[PDB]
Ligand binder design. Structure first.
Ligand code: MG
Ligand code: MG
Ligand code: MG
Ligand code: MG
Ligand code: MG
Ligand code: MG
Ligand code: MG
Ligand code: MG
Ligand code: MG
Ligand code: MG
Ligand code: MG
Ligand code: MG
Ligand code: MG
Ligand code: MG
Ligand code: MG
Ligand code: MG
Ligand code: MG
Ligand code: MG
Ligand code: MG
Ligand code: MG
Ligand code: MG
Ligand code: MG
Ligand code: MG
Ligand code: MG
Ligand code: MG
Ligand code: MG
Ligand code: MG
Ligand code: MG
Ligand code: MG
Ligand code: MG
Ligand code: MG
Ligand code: MG
Ligand code: MG
Ligand code: MG
Ligand code: MG
Ligand code: MG
Ligand code: MG
Ligand code: MG
Ligand code: MG
Ligand code: MG
Ligand code: MG
Ligand code: MG
Ligand code: MG
Ligand code: MG
Ligand code: MG
Ligand code: MG
Ligand code: MG
Ligand code: MG
Ligand code: MG
Ligand code: MG
Ligand code: MG
Ligand code: MG
Ligand code: MG
Ligand code: MG
Ligand code: MG
Ligand code: MG
Ligand code: MG
Ligand code: MG
Ligand code: MG
Ligand code: MG
Ligand code: MG
Ligand code: MG
Ligand code: MG
Ligand code: MG
Ligand code: MG
Ligand code: MG
Ligand code: MG
Ligand code: MG
Ligand code: MG
Ligand code: MG
Ligand code: MG
Ligand code: MG
Ligand code: MG
Ligand code: MG
Ligand code: MG
Ligand code: MG
Ligand code: MG
Ligand code: MG
Ligand code: MG
Ligand code: MG
Ligand code: MG
Ligand code: MG
Ligand code: MG
Ligand code: MG
Ligand code: MG
Ligand code: MG
Ligand code: MG
Ligand code: MG
Ligand code: MG
Ligand code: MG
Ligand code: MG
Ligand code: MG
Ligand code: MG
Ligand code: MG
Ligand code: MG
Ligand code: MG
Ligand code: MG
Ligand code: MG
Ligand code: MG
Ligand code: MG
Ligand code: MG
Ligand code: MG
Ligand code: MG
Ligand code: MG
Ligand code: MG
Ligand code: MG
Ligand code: MG
Ligand code: MG
Ligand code: MG
Ligand code: MG
Ligand code: MG
Ligand code: MG
Ligand code: MG
Ligand code: MG
Ligand code: MG
Ligand code: MG
Ligand code: MG
Ligand code: MG
Ligand code: MG
Ligand code: MG
Lengths: 96, 122, 82, 99
RNA sequence: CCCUCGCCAAGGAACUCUGCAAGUUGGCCCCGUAACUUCGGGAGAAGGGGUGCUCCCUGGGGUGAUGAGCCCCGGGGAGCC
RNA sequence: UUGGAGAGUUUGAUCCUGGCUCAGGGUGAACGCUGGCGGCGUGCCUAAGACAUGCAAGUCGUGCGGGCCGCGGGUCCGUGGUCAGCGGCGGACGGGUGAGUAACGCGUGGGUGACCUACCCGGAAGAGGGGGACAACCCGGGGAAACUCGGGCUAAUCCCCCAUGUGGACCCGCCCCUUGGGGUGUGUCCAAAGGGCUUUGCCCGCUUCCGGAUGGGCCCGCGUCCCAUCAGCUAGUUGGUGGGGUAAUGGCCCACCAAGGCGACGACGGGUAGCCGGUCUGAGAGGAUGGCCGGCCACAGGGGCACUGAGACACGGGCCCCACUCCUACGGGAGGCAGCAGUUAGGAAUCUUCCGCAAUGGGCGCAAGCCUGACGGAGCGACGCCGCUUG
RNA sequence: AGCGCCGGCCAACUCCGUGCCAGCAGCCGCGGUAAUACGGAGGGCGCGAGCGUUACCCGGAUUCACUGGGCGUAAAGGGCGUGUAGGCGGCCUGGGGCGUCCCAUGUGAAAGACCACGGCUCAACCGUGGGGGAGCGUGGGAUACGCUCAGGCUAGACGG
RNA sequence: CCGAGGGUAGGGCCCGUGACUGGGGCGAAGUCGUAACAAGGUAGCUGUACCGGAAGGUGCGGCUGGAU
């Protein structure tokens, strides 16, 4: 009727709340920049995409994201903005 | 308001799932049983290898009724089903669990063991 | 981590450890990477300890960590000498 | 080494994928006689360049799909429609083994 | 009180010679469907899901001219009470 | 070339055919009769039925703030424990079991230009600024208890922001190579933590990148039982395009497109079964088997699920549904021995609620050390082999 | 110091009792009034802290026969054709090298097994060393036979 | 959205069980007849068919594993 396993569980929730919070923003700020790119609206898309890049890697600093998950998440974020902006171009500002 | 022919769910783990009242054990000629009354019933549907089988003539006590029962405080209570718990000739439940809520009237009628096994007394 | 360990053999009241490099999490008498010597803590026979020192230096050089008793059996064999 | 096998394209009816029918001979582990056995492989053809009767070589590649674990390597011989006829006749003969 | 008709708590054939009478079920579209069989059937077996309205996208036919318009068969997506 | 024995029984008698039977060896055995000792093995093969009680995983005060108690004085501080709390690391190892699985599960040989790996080792480079919360604690409510919610305070190797970029990542280019391998340039993006002593000095820690090493994931050829009185099977079904997902390939998952995939070389179905090193037999070939030991896999009351994390979809972690059981003050609550002993049930049948961490080994720690039913030993059983006695 | 056994197989025999009873029995079989076969006893044979039994695996079983069997009458030729798949296939030359053979090399964990030596007084148990393969990966080689491809023949086969 | 599972309805496979019923194996000394073994007193066997308390009988065609 006890353990140090109960402490590992109390901690797992402090981290779960923290990991879910970071992923929510990553998906929000990223998708936000992909809609903006489709409109394009390039300075606005790229000004947001960069904060989506920053949040991604800042998550890989710890346990929220593996290095490769972030690098793959970054790869698809940028790749979608390129083609989307190829229609109705003008990439200004710059981020690639 | 249970009478002969009335089907009742079985709110225990005896093995029986549906029983059909064949007698109201409350005098010479009671028309109806409510909660706390004992009936005699045949078992119409059992699950395999439970204590009671289909074809058994058992006693049970009604624990839930769809006809609302009235109380001296001016209130009433009604359940979605008609349900009973199977007993022996000592008011004691023949199973070890009671499923679903039961009426508080059972306590006054001396079906205490059922009241305790029930997950909610309303 | 890789560790340098004594996996007991022999029989009851009859110890005979093997000088073995094995994973830190492998069970004691389980499968090991290499056998680099042996040991007879009672010294009942002339050569109770022997060590392939050239090999024990490799695993020491590549990461493996000894035990507080395996270490004294590689120092007793001069794996650490100058 | 990535296993390399040689077989024949028995069915090209898919997009970017052909069916390569490979045979292999070996002695019976008890009766010593040499016996033939066969196996079909779904092989990748991203250029849809391979047709029925081609005698191709496949190389053990990374999964393209469930069951697709070989890429077609090189054409060795074209037009061996005699082998595909041995295959289809065998399959057609199966309706004769029914109840 | 009778006729014809509507509704009913809890029960649900306990009615009665008999579920008599009356409920239930009920069209269309789709899914699906048993013993047995003379291979047709049994079959609408059973059992289920769907059904209004709005906007948007779209496939074929008839008339016409190949088009518009009128008209007939559909398909997909998103909504509303 | 180290290896090969047969006999009884059909007839009045014979020869042949053929079945039954026997002599041998073996067992996790059991049963009867009998029973002295020692050693080393070994002992729930059935109900993966149900379980009383204890124990089987913790550790760091050299990360941090605290309540207590004891020690030296100035009711303030050092210090020693001590207790819970926050923060580390371990808890994914080790230990059990054989249910399920006829499968890339296992064996064997290979693939990864489709991949991850904490701690360990080696090489490169760095630690500069600022802020914040939550438990402990105080205050309030509820309760039999399990035990909570409320408000407010507070530290840190906890948490964010800025900076620096040795460096790495990503996108678009060119170069080598050739499945996503390696280079480089432009843009963008990401580092941190401090603690101890003897102190212009070490030590344990921290951060980013590379390599090693070990441990894995995934994929493929091949091998793997009985029934054909199971002969046809298939809609995520087979392939394609796009995407989601992951460390990573893939129908693994989703949309749409195409009409495919499989099968007498036995598909599909039904039965049984964890598989191998090996074990037992055998002249060999072969047959039988997979307990002990080692490797791998699978499961942790029956199912589903994810979270935390290098790593689990986690036996002694969490959520939910079911079956069962238990406490209760009757309002409500709890549990998961296929860990080690032990109990009960079933069965022809299968052990001590023992001892110690001294050894080996594991975890944490600067270290003294602490935990360790792993283990090392002791106990019961002619169960087995070996040795010994009753002269 | 006990347990099994003493008709043949199969090692060990007499007396009594019983009288198709009581019983034995792995098989063939024993017992119906002189039983080495039932029961006891004497004696004897085999083992010995064991000895018997039951269950099960392999062997004997060449009784699933690859090694290593059969089918007129013992069990066994399909009632007979035709033909699909499949198995198998004449003589000569060459190209390849799939089978097949050889050499090299990697893998084949530890334990076990086997041989040598040693430690527990021996042994069981245990340590240390030695020696191997098959199978598969790779590199090199051989080409008789089997395979394939190509060319020629006429003895099989088919046609005039 | 998926989703353990719960519910409703309809199939398939297997196991056990059932009044009664079919024949089968076995069982020291039952009852009936005598089919087969000799030319077994009707040569036998045979596929089929029909009949009869029972073996069997008879038809058709076939075999010699039929005697003299
Ligand atoms: Mg959002
Ligand atoms: Mg990371
Ligand atoms: Mg209920
Ligand atoms: Mg119930
Ligand atoms: Mg029952
Ligand atoms: Mg019934
Ligand atoms: Mg009851
Ligand atoms: Mg209650
Ligand atoms: Mg001892
Ligand atoms: Mg491991
Ligand atoms: Mg109405
Ligand atoms: Mg009304
Ligand atoms: Mg009514
Ligand atoms: Mg009603
Ligand atoms: Mg009703
Ligand atoms: Mg009803
Ligand atoms: Mg009626
Ligand atoms: Mg009536
Ligand atoms: Mg009546
Ligand atoms: Mg009438
Ligand atoms: Mg009517
Ligand atoms: Mg109506
Ligand atoms: Mg209607
Ligand atoms: Mg009507
Ligand atoms: Mg039908
Ligand atoms: Mg039916
Ligand atoms: Mg019917
Ligand atoms: Mg009918
Ligand atoms: Mg009918
Ligand atoms: Mg018919
Ligand atoms: Mg018919
Ligand atoms: Mg029909
Ligand atoms: Mg039909
Ligand atoms: Mg009808
Ligand atoms: Mg209908
Ligand atoms: Mg219909
Ligand atoms: Mg309907
Ligand atoms: Mg609809
Ligand atoms: Mg609608
Ligand atoms: Mg309307
Ligand atoms: Mg007209
Ligand atoms: Mg028109
Ligand atoms: Mg509404
Ligand atoms: Mg005889
Ligand atoms: Mg005879
Ligand atoms: Mg005789
Ligand atoms: Mg014989
Ligand atoms: Mg004694
Ligand atoms: Mg067991
Ligand atoms: Mg048990
Ligand atoms: Mg049971
Ligand atoms: Mg303890
Ligand atoms: Mg502490
Ligand atoms: Mg198993
Ligand atoms: Mg088993
Ligand atoms: Mg199966
Ligand atoms: Mg496999
Ligand atoms: Mg494999
Ligand atoms: Mg970790
Ligand atoms: Mg609080
Ligand atoms: Mg920064
Ligand atoms: Mg799939
Ligand atoms: Mg789909
Ligand atoms: Mg389609
Ligand atoms: Mg095949
Ligand atoms: Mg099974
Ligand atoms: Mg099993
Ligand atoms: Mg033999
Ligand atoms: Mg096996
Ligand atoms: Mg076993
Ligand atoms: Mg499970
Ligand atoms: Mg259990
Ligand atoms: Mg389970
Ligand atoms: Mg569970
Ligand atoms: Mg698991
Ligand atoms: Mg755990
Ligand atoms: Mg447990
Ligand atoms: Mg509650
Ligand atoms: Mg609760
Ligand atoms: Mg719970
Ligand atoms: Mg016990
Ligand atoms: Mg018992
Ligand atoms: Mg210790
Ligand atoms: Mg202890
Ligand atoms: Mg004897
Ligand atoms: Mg003998
Ligand atoms: Mg003799
Ligand atoms: Mg026997
Ligand atoms: Mg006499
Ligand atoms: Mg006589
Ligand atoms: Mg006599
Ligand atoms: Mg006898
Ligand atoms: Mg005898
Ligand atoms: Mg005698
Ligand atoms: Mg045998
Ligand atoms: Mg044999
Ligand atoms: Mg036989
Ligand atoms: Mg032969
Ligand atoms: Mg023979
Ligand atoms: Mg014959
Ligand atoms: Mg013939
Ligand atoms: Mg025929
Ligand atoms: Mg042919
Ligand atoms: Mg041929
Ligand atoms: Mg030839
Ligand atoms: Mg070759
Ligand atoms: Mg080897
Ligand atoms: Mg070996
Ligand atoms: Mg040894
Ligand atoms: Mg050895
Ligand atoms: Mg479902
Ligand atoms: Mg369901
Ligand atoms: Mg439920
Ligand atoms: Mg008589
Ligand atoms: Mg006659
Ligand atoms: Mg006669
Ligand atoms: Mg005659
Ligand atoms: Mg006659
Ligand atoms: Mg006749
Ligand atoms: Mg006649």
């Amino acid at each position: 009727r006890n353990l140090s396993a109960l402490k590992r569980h109390r901690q797992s929730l402090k981290r779960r709340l923290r990991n879910k919070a970071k992923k929510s923003a990553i998906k929000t700020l990223s998708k936000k920049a992909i809609q903006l790119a489709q409109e394009g609206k390039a300075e606005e898309a790229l000004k947001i995409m960069r904060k989506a890049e920053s949040l991604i890697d800042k998550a890989a600093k710890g346990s929220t994201l593996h290095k490769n998950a972030a690098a793959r998440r970054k790869s698809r974020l940028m790749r979608k903005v390129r083609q989307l902006l190829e229609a109705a171009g003008a990439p200004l500002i710059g981020g690639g | 308001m249970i009478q002969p022919q009335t089907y009742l769910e079985v709110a225990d783990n005896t093995g029986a799932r549906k029983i059909m009242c064949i007698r109201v054990l409350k005098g010479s000629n009671a028309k109806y049983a409510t909660v706390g009354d004992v009936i005699v019933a045949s078992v119409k549907e059992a699950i395999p290898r439970g204590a009671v089988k289909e074809g058994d003539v058992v006693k049970a006590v009604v624990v839930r009724t769809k006809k609302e029962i009235k109380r001296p405080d001016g209130s009433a209570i009604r359940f979605d089903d008609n349900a009973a718990v199977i007993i022996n000739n000592q008011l004691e439940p023949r199973g070890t669990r009671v499923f679903g809520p039961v009426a508080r009237e059972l306590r006054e009628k001396g079906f205490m063991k059922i009241v305790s096994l029930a997950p909610e007394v309303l | 981590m890789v560790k340098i360990r004594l996996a007991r053999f022999g029989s009851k009241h009859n110890p005979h450890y093997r000088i073995v490099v094995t994973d830190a999490r492998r069970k004691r008498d389980g499968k090991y990477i290499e056998k680099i010597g042996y040991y007879d803590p009672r010294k009942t026979t002339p050569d109770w300890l022997k060590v392939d020192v050239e090999r024990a230096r490799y695993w020491l050089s590549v990461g493996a960590q000894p035990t507080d008793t395996a270490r004294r059996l590689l120092r007793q064999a001069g794996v650490f000498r100058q | 080494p990535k296993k390399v096998l040689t077989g024949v394209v028995v069915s090209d009816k898919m997009q970017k994928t052909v069916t390569v029918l490979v045979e292999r001979q070996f002695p019976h582990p008890l009766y010593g006689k040499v016996i033939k056995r066969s196996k079909k492989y779904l092989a990748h053809d991203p250029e849809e360049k391979y047709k029925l009767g081609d005698v191709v070589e496949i190389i053990e590649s990374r999964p393209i799909s469930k069951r697709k674990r070989f890429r077609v390597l090189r054409l060795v011989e074209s037009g061996r429609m005699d082998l595909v006829e041995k295959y289809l006749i065998r399959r057609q003969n199966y309706e004769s083994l029914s109840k």
